[PDB]
Amino acid sequence: MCDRKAVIKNADMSEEMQQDSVECATQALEKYNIEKDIAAHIKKEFDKKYNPTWHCIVGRNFGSYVTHETKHFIYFYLGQVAILLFKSG
Amino acid sequence: MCDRKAVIKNADMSEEMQQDSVECATQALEKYNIEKDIAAHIKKEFDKKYNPTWHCIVGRNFGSYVTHETKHFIYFYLGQVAILLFKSG
Amino acid sequence: KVNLKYDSWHKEVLSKFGQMLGSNMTEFHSQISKSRQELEQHSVDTAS
Numbered sequence: 001m002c003d004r005k006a007v008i009k010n011a012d013m014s015e016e017m018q019q020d021s022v023e024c025a026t027q028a029l030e031k032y033n034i035e036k037d038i039a040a041h042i043k044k045e046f047d048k049k050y051n052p053t054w055h056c057i058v059g060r061n062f063g064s065y066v067t068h069e070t071k072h073f074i075y076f077y078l079g080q081v082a083i084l085l086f087k088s089g
Numbered sequence: 090m091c092d093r094k095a096v097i098k099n100a101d102m103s104e105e106m107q108q109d110s111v112e113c114a115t116q117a118l119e120k121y122n123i124e125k126d127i128a129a130h131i132k133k134e135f136d137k138k139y140n141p142t143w144h145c146i147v148g149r150n151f152g153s154y155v156t157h158e159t160k161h162f163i164y165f166y167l168g169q170v171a172i173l174l175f176k177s178g
Numbered sequence: 179k180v181n182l183k184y185d186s187w188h189k190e191v192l193s194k195f196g197q198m199l200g201s202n203m204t205e206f207h208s209q210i211s212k213s214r215q216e217l218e219q220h221s222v223d224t225a226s
Contacts, residue, residue, distance in 0.1 A: 012210070015168030035123050035190055043154055052156070055144060055177060059151035063125025065132050067142045069178070089156060089177030 004029070008076035012068065021074050025083050030073065035059065036069075038081075046085060056085040093118075099164040105135065109150075110163055110174060124148055131174060134164060142178025147171075 006022040013021075021042075028041040035058045043056040054072075057064065059082050068071070072087035095111040110131070117130030124147040127149050132145035139161075146153060161176035 001161045034148075034152060036154065039152045040154050041126065048138035053177070055153075055175075057146060057151055057153040057155075059148055061124075062146065062148040062151060063123065063128055064144075064148075065125060065130075066130040066144055067136070089158070 002030075002079075004079040006078055007075050008074060009082075010073070010075040012073040013071055018076075019050070019073055020083055021046075021083075022076060022078070025076070025078050025081075029078060029081060035081075038083075042083070042085060053089050054085055054087045055089075057084070058083050093167045093170075095167060097165045098153070099162065101161045101162050107163055109138075110172075111167075112171060114174075115167065118167070125168075131172070135174070135176075139176065143174065143176050146173040172177055 006025075008018060008022075011018055016085075022072070024045050025042055026036050028038045032041060038058045039056045042058075043054055046054045046056070060080060062082055064084060066084075066086050068086035068087070068088045074086070075082070075084045076077060077083065092098055093115060097107070100107060114131045115141070116140075117127045119128065121127055121130070127147040129144045131147070132143050135143040135166060136140075144155070147170065148170050151159035151173075152174055153164075155175055157177055157178065163175070164171075164173045166172070
């Protein structure tokens with residue numbers, strides 16, 4: 001297992017499901033090579049798990065400004081992959 | 090004025106809101122230089138005009154599947170500046 | 179030997195800090211979680 005240490009750069013979220021985000025993004029990154037499909041898998045998994053609706057992005061060189069639901073925002077890093085997932089809508 | 094053309098990739102929305110996005114977000118690009126601040130412009134401004142809750146992403150190379158309300162998704166390239174903007178609230 | 183001893187000593191000195199870091203973390207959580215509801219309840223009306 002490639003130990004991709006996660007450092008979450010912003011969050012309004014509970015810690016348990018923040019680590020759930022870390023683990024799910026780890027599995028998605030290990031499973032898919034397309035950044036679009038990484039976002040696909042993470043977003044579908046979260047919509048299934050904690051009830052829709054979220055929005056997820058993965059990238060390298062990015063900023064983004066967002067209004068989210070409380071306790072429903074995360075932005076972290078795995079490896080070289082910035083990963084964002086918030087709930088709004 | 091550099092005709093950074095709004096060459097369009099994905100859209101379900103009005104041409105008018107498309108191209109209003111185009112000028113004012115180009116306005117965002119013009120004074121500023123920073124991707125997150127450009128996003129601050131664009132998302133705040135359509136929270137002003139097309140009402141919250143908008144969501145904007147400024148970058149160059151990413152994969153984003155999100156949920157957007159009907160006629161509320163713009164995703165195109167302005168130069169290498171990839172601009173994604175959808176409503177969700 | 180004594181460089182290794184310095185190393186282990188400094189590392190264990192670092193180690194104790196995470197507890198009070200978590201203390202202020204719980205302060206963060208306590209502030210925000212209660213403050214969301216605390217902004218939401220009150221209003222100009224409700225003559226209580």
